[PDB]
Amino acid sequence: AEQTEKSFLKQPKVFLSTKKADKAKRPGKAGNRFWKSVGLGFKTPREAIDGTYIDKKCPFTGTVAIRGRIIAGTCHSAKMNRTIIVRRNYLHFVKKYQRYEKRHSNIPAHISPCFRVKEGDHVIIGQCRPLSKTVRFNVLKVVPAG
Amino acid sequence: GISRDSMHKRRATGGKQKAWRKKRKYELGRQPANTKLSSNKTVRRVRVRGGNVKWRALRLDTGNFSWGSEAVTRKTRLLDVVYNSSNNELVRTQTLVKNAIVQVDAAPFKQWYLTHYGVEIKSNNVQRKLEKRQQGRTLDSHIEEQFSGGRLLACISSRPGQCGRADGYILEGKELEFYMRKLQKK
Amino acid sequence: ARGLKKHLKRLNAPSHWMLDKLGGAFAPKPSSGPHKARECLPLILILRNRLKYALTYREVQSILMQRHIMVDGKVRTDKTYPAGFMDIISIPKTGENYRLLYDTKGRFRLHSVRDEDAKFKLCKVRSVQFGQKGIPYLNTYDGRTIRYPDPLIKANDTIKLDLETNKIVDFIKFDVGNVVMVTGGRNTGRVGVIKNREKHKGTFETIHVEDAQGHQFATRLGNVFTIGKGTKPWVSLPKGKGIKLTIIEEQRKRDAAAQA
RNA sequence: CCCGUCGCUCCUACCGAUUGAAUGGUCCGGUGAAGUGUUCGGAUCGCGGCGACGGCCGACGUCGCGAGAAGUCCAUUGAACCUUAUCAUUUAGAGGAAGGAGAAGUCGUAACAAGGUUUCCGUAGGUGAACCUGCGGAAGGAUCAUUG
RNA sequence: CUCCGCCGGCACCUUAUGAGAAAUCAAAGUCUUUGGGUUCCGGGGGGAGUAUGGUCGCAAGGCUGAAACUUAAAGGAAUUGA
RNA sequence: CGUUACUUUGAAGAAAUUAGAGUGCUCAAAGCAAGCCAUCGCUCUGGAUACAUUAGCAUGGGAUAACAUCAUAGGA
RNA sequence: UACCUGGUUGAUCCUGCCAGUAGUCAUAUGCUUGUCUCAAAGAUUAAGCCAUGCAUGUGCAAGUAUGAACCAAUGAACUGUGAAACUGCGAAUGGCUCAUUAAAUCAGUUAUAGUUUGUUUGAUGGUAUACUCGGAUAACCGUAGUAAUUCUAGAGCUAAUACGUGCAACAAACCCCGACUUCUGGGAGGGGCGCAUUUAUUAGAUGAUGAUUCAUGAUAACUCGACGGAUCGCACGGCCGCCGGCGACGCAUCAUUCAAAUUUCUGCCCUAUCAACUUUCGAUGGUAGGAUAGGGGCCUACCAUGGUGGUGACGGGUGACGGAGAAUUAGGGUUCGAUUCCGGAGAGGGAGCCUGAGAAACGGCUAC
Ligand SMILES: [K+]
Ligand SMILES: [K+]
Ligand SMILES: [K+]
Ligand SMILES: [K+]
Ligand SMILES: [K+]
Ligand SMILES: [K+]
Ligand SMILES: [K+]
Ligand SMILES: [K+]
Ligand SMILES: [K+]
Ligand SMILES: [Mg+2]
Ligand SMILES: [Mg+2]
Ligand SMILES: [Mg+2]
Ligand SMILES: [Mg+2]
Ligand SMILES: [Mg+2]
Ligand SMILES: [Mg+2]
Ligand SMILES: [Mg+2]
Ligand SMILES: [Mg+2]
Ligand SMILES: [Mg+2]
Ligand SMILES: [Mg+2]
Ligand SMILES: [Mg+2]
Ligand SMILES: [Mg+2]
Ligand SMILES: [Mg+2]
Ligand SMILES: [Mg+2]
Ligand SMILES: [Mg+2]
Ligand SMILES: [Mg+2]
Ligand SMILES: [Mg+2]
Ligand SMILES: [Mg+2]
């Protein structure tokens, strides 16, 4: 079902054709789906542990690590393959007038199939290595608007 | 020369970026090895950053291949390139790249299987160990039907243009079924 | 730049060196070595600016090329050798031994030590992990690698190293209640006991230290160096005893000294 | 006190055909040095080899390995050149038409008094010029006022 | 019709304890004892609502809108005189 | 197992420049020296401290304010 | 020092500007100029063009002397001191300038679990004629060529820590095959096995991190591996020929240090008479590769239609390098920041490279 590419898609360093298969072993062993806790107090979604998708850029089942900044925001666009635009809204202080002005930043973030998101949801992203030209963040937690 | 810099790209907004510096050597790229499957082995020494060595295979005909379920690794001849997921140009040109699907000689694996299991696909100790191994022995009949022709489907897991070698694993299981469907659809 | 910098402009030199502004265009750029360039005291500074043995760059060269100076038991002839915190500087001709400690103002001070006390240094464990062959090994912040360390030794620990034998003779576990000296930041040279360790996932860890007179200060984990098990440091301390004084109390001391 | 036209001396700016030129940048096609990688290539040089000849040396025939220059092939980066058009400049320019300043002539007297037709706003037409007139509006009016 | 109230509206009269350059204004007040909220909009007088570009309009024109240059005043309210 | 602004405290925010402690370069602009009855030496001599928007990290506070909810609580 | 004064009128009070008044680590210019201390100085216009000279060379006891070199000694390989030359290292720092460049540089703040790093410091190194291998070459010497240049050819010599080879002091353990044995085993023998490289399988529990299929172990193989000392100085003693100290230089691995590269967030002047821009031919994302030291449309193939924008995208202007800072400042603020500190960039304009740990180097090369 997940094999939608011109290539087979496998989790790196997981031997699927193992003969001594076992489910009591740790993830990635005996043909088990690999997954990890990203750390920083973030729970691993159960749909990543029980998923069948293959995403190398997934924070929980892929090869990327979360290190650096942790940024909150709102889903501003979700029209790309596994990538969403996160809009951050903040107040910029103007020194001379002692006032604030509203400013925004559009941060591209990779979203793994373990989350389904819609424009307007509150998301938490964590900094990772560069994944594309503009993406340096991975969605870590999605809070729906309602 | 070939560069890897973000200078020449457009911005994410679409705006053009005016250059503020010439190309640095620490951001170069080199021309692809374009490793061909041929019995005229040529691997060239590439001097890289730090005075280190990169091995650039131009023509290769032999590789180190692992049969993961059997946990055995043998040196086998490369016979043909059959499937590439990025470009069939690389299939017709017989270009060896990482994740290419190739035909490899099955003779070393047949020999090892006969020696280790006693089964073709003289002592009490030898026969006892052979019967112990033969108990629970299970092949998957797809590897068997390609053993009949003497050619095993394999995936090149090494990068020939970087390490100068064409190494890989023998395809098994779901990956094997996927690539057999791809090759029959070809 | 197209490579490493070889020169240190005198203005860009570390401020704890107390180099003067008009002494020249340049400062001694510390050579690579056991301590970081920004946190060391080069040998030329110790010999000329501090101990006054030499009066010039060339005189420092003359002293060092005579093989008169040993750093931690070994003869050094490099003038920009980066001598650092807790290093033993011995001159086995005048029979004097110096431990590089910090005064409460953040500046390295050559502290005279006994001959027996110059036989060990205190090192801070940077990491413990498996090397080649699966052999456990220890590394410190002063550049030493020690193989087969005691398994009870962890990162951020303080080990006592015998310079003669080059082995860990004792070690201190980084725990609450151990006397420490701050080696970095604005509290450099301050001595107190750890009261609590506040940990925050993914960022630097904060240590809360209270000195003997009751003043409380906080600093990052990378700037804390354990110097004793409990309230008794393993080495001798400079005259300040790590107790920082406010400028008002310093003025009180100056007034009392002038009055006497 | 004052407004405008027309005269006359200078200054500034504008429009302006000539499809005005000069300068550089982009766009489109090409051509394309040089380097880098790659394919052949093999001047030449070594090491050995088989047997032999002549007196360890030397020559020839013989046969392998290794290194390898010129040259050459394809790819790549790509200066630079030519071409189309565009942009940004600099920019003459017949002629036209403003504004200002200065002398200051001329024709009147339009605005200031109810300025001698009260003034002005908008719009339209006309006239040597200030202006005139039509329609609606305002008092900044020359009326804060007719229960008479 | 008459009288007394309440709310809302167009206004009017008196008064300064206010404000203002004053005229005057019961808001044009509650401002150097300076801050309720918000929109538009001015920065000496001309050149100039002109040139040019853009946009709207069939047109007339509307909206947006300079600069070069020039000038020591222009202007407001009030007083006395003519 | 609601955030944020705001505020408080802490760590950082190079040096030089600035503010500022000490110090009689003869004064001063300076400099980072120096001082001590005179000392085969000493004062462990000194070579402080403050400031450093905004943004980032951490601590306490929740008045003011912003956003998100806010009778299938269908609550536990 | 929280400051005003003259100028519209016959006179008045205003609005309002003009003019004056002070400063400038602010330039020029004029006049004048005795002493002390201090001190900028071809930035502004031309990152315009340059005669000449200099700015990068380098030797320890410890790589290599047979100068037909010098001093001293006077049957001995090499006395000593040593020019020259080979070898090694450096010349990627520093100095100069501010042309380009407007979220770009840069600043503060992150990250590398996304990499390289000569050197320093610390630790580490076992399965590959030996009382020690081979061929060259410089200096030297002498035949030259050319108008000429650290332009250049041929001949004769001879070194190594140059170059190229080659024993590499020996070992256990572990893995595989496996004659025989009496046998769920024993077991001769054979093969593998240093370190590095590449792939694959497996362990890493309930040693490490906030977090890793992590550190690291084991196994199967793989590679035509520039690795695993044919080097030098001083002292030279102990046992009966064998052992033997203190060093120097060099190879490889990890760590450290010196750093770079890339990278997170936030922050920049004027302009809307610049409102749409980007996407054929990368624009935004996805998959698989290639390339790189390493992440990444960095590039390629295929796929999807995204991405930015009145919270001003895109474009234009800047007599725009950014910052630390500077001038003036009651407070708030205004203006400047070519220049000695930090960062960046360039070496007439482009482009491309070799060497090297490090350069897209220009007191290096190649081309236009
Ligand atoms: K650099
Ligand atoms: K009239
Ligand atoms: K009138
Ligand atoms: K009423
Ligand atoms: K070099
Ligand atoms: K920064
Ligand atoms: K990469
Ligand atoms: K991609
Ligand atoms: K080098
Ligand atoms: Mg009239
Ligand atoms: Mg009239
Ligand atoms: Mg006000
Ligand atoms: Mg005006
Ligand atoms: Mg003021
Ligand atoms: Mg430099
Ligand atoms: Mg591992
Ligand atoms: Mg990729
Ligand atoms: Mg400029
Ligand atoms: Mg500057
Ligand atoms: Mg300039
Ligand atoms: Mg200069
Ligand atoms: Mg600089
Ligand atoms: Mg450069
Ligand atoms: Mg020039
Ligand atoms: Mg260059
Ligand atoms: Mg030069
Ligand atoms: Mg240079």
Side-chain angles (χ1 to χ4, degrees):
Chain A
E2 63 271 6
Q3 305 298 341
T4 80
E5 315 286 1
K6 288 163 50 175
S7 149
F8 192 78
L9 312 170
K10 61 199 307 293
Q11 278 189 302
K13 260 286 316 183
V14 201
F15 190 41
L16 302 174
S17 305
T18 171
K19 260 158 190 143
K20 281 150 226 83
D22 177 285
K23 300 297 188 180
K25 301 226 191 180
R26 291 177 335 271
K29 307 227 142 190
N32 291 12
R33 168 180 203 72
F34 174 77
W35 61 269
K36 57 181 157 184
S37 66
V38 297
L40 296 173
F42 278 99
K43 319 342 295 161
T44 311
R46 271 298 335 191
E47 32 272 46
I49 312 178
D50 283 334
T52 60
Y53 69 87
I54 301 300
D55 199 332
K56 67 166 137 304
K57 304 164 184 187
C58 176
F60 304 97
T61 78
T63 89
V64 309
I66 299 305
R67 69 287 181 285
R69 305 282 191 178
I70 293 278
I71 289 170
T74 302
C75 185
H76 166 82
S77 204
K79 293 179 179 179
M80 308 192 273
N81 199 348
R82 283 161 167 192
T83 313
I84 72 162
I85 308 287
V86 163
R87 166 157 178 139
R88 212 181 61 88
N89 286 307
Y90 56 99
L91 291 187
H92 179 237
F93 183 66
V94 192
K95 192 39 171 142
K96 179 189 191 173
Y97 302 95
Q98 294 285 129
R99 312 302 208 274
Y100 299 92
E101 56 185 27
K102 276 158 163 194
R103 279 190 196 201
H104 84 268
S105 182
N106 272 351
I107 312 165
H110 167 271
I111 182 151
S112 58
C114 53
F115 313 100
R116 293 182 183 174
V117 80
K118 293 179 179 179
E119 279 99 322
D121 291 348
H122 172 32
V123 298
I124 305 283
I125 63 183
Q127 202 206 321
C128 69
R129 75 162 178 274
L131 295 175
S132 68
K133 186 169 177 301
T134 66
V135 167
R136 290 91 165 88
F137 284 85
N138 253 302
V139 170
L140 308 188
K141 168 163 210 76
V142 168
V143 185
Chain B
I2 312 154
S3 200
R4 292 181 303 110
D5 60 323
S6 290
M7 191 136 264
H8 69 291
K9 294 292 272 171
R10 294 195 158 271
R11 282 197 185 90
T13 69
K16 254 198 271 193
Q17 330 186 79
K18 293 179 179 179
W20 61 274
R21 63 181 198 188
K22 277 177 177 69
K23 300 166 166 176
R24 301 277 186 263
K25 186 263 175 182
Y26 64 58
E27 69 199 15
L28 58 69
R30 303 187 188 90
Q31 257 194 117
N34 285 335
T35 311
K36 310 277 92 142
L37 193 161
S38 167
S39 66
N40 191 262
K41 189 178 170 185
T42 279
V43 176
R44 307 235 158 101
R45 228 184 164 280
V46 171
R47 188 283 185 192
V48 307
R49 189 173 180 89
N52 296 305
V53 175
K54 256 186 205 172
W55 290 105
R56 185 132 277 150
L58 296 183
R59 270 161 334 270
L60 274 187
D61 64 62
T62 290
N64 189 46
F65 286 94
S66 271
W67 189 359
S69 304
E70 298 316 337
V72 68
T73 315
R74 284 320 180 241
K75 209 177 80 158
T76 87
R77 172 153 280 72
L78 322 158
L79 314 161
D80 216 60
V81 188
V82 292
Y83 195 62
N84 197 233
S85 64
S86 50
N87 194 358
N88 63 3
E89 208 38 28
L90 311 192
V91 179
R92 181 177 181 170
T93 56
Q94 286 299 281
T95 317
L96 306 155
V97 280
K98 183 178 179 180
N99 216 240
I101 302 307
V102 286
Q103 298 291 61
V104 299
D105 221 313
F109 288 110
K110 288 222 316 153
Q111 195 39 60
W112 166 90
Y113 203 98
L114 191 281
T115 284
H116 175 261
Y117 279 106
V119 176
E120 204 295 323
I121 290 152
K122 294 204 172 183
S123 162
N124 314 153
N125 192 31
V126 168
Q127 273 317 350
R128 207 160 28 260
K129 79 195 287 196
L130 280 207
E131 293 177 350
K132 192 150 29 43
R133 296 178 181 168
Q134 261 159 324
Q135 141 174 349
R137 176 190 146 281
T138 48
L139 199 36
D140 290 80
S141 35
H142 288 287
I143 316 201
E144 183 178 2
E145 44 95 50
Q146 29 184 321
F147 266 115
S148 307
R151 299 193 161 196
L152 294 159
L153 280 175
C155 188
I156 292 303
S157 45
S158 93
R159 306 184 70 203
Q162 306 281 296
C163 74
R165 291 188 217 173
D167 293 3
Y169 46 111
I170 304 292
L171 296 176
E172 332 199 59
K174 293 179 179 179
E175 195 165 342
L176 185 48
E177 310 161 14
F178 175 96
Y179 278 116
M180 264 170 316
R181 291 193 297 274
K182 288 294 190 293
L183 288 168
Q184 81 192 30
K185 291 187 317 161
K186 164 192 61 174
Chain C
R2 300 200 310 285
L4 294 156
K5 289 324 179 62
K6 296 308 174 186
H7 302 91
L8 187 58
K9 291 301 181 66
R10 196 175 188 92
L11 279 189
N12 184 30
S15 64
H16 53 105
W17 292 355
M18 301 179 272
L19 288 198
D20 69 28
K21 157 168 73 142
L22 298 180
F26 289 108
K29 206 206 181 199
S31 66
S32 46
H35 305 267
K36 289 199 145 293
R38 285 292 165 177
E39 188 161 68
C40 82
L41 191 58
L43 270 187
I44 172 150
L45 265 39
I46 298 164
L47 271 192
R48 167 188 62 174
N49 304 62
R50 298 286 189 271
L51 292 188
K52 307 298 185 182
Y53 283 128
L55 300 161
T56 42
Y57 185 83
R58 151 185 317 160
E59 226 158 41
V60 160
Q61 200 188 47
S62 281
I63 290 184
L64 279 168
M65 230 42 51
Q66 273 164 270
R67 290 178 81 76
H68 279 335
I69 305 305
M70 293 178 351
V71 179
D72 281 297
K74 295 214 217 162
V75 167
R76 300 305 169 183
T77 68
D78 204 82
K79 33 212 175 202
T80 60
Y81 187 77
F85 182 69
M86 276 279 183
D87 282 3
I88 302 285
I89 295 89
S90 79
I91 317 165
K93 195 196 203 308
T94 88
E96 245 300 280
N97 293 261
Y98 294 112
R99 203 182 291 282
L100 267 190
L101 303 150
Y102 285 114
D103 74 29
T104 42
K105 300 200 176 181
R107 301 151 334 183
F108 276 121
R109 285 297 172 211
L110 295 153
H111 178 69
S112 203
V113 296
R114 293 182 183 174
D115 289 345
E116 293 177 350
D117 282 345
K119 293 179 179 179
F120 72 94
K121 66 171 324 187
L122 288 196
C123 308
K124 183 182 181 181
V125 182
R126 170 200 312 263
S127 46
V128 187
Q129 65 272 291
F130 281 22
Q132 225 201 6
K133 300 295 184 180
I135 295 172
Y137 84 75
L138 187 148
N139 78 350
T140 66
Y141 288 98
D142 73 88
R144 309 183 150 284
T145 288
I146 297 150
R147 291 200 331 170
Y148 299 116
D150 190 309
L152 291 163
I153 295 169
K154 304 286 177 184
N156 296 144
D157 271 2
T158 286
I159 59 185
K160 180 174 179 175
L161 220 74
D162 184 1
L163 302 181
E164 201 76 358
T165 321
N166 194 21
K167 64 179 180 180
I168 304 180
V169 290
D170 204 1
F171 77 97
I172 303 171
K173 293 178 179 179
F174 187 83
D175 285 1
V176 159
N178 288 340
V179 70
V180 284
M181 180 183 266
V182 177
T183 63
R186 62 180 295 175
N187 307 329
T188 303
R190 286 187 82 173
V191 169
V193 299
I194 298 175
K195 279 306 188 318
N196 60 290
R197 326 169 37 181
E198 211 204 6
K199 281 166 253 53
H200 297 287
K201 272 166 159 17
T203 191
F204 55 87
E205 187 269 348
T206 300
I207 298 287
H208 282 91
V209 188
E210 190 223 83
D211 61 356
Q213 298 190 357
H215 310 91
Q216 273 138 351
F217 40 103
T219 171
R220 301 187 184 187
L221 176 102
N223 283 342
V224 180
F225 189 110
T226 311
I227 60 182
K229 205 270 163 273
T231 36
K232 177 31 190 133
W234 281 7
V235 291
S236 37
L237 286 177
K239 267 191 156 196
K241 293 179 179 179
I243 300 263
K244 198 171 189 179
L245 278 206
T246 76
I247 51 180
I248 299 208
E249 324 175 294
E250 307 173 20
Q251 230 277 327
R252 263 216 263 290
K253 280 168 64 233
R254 287 196 258 115
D255 186 2
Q259 187 274 331

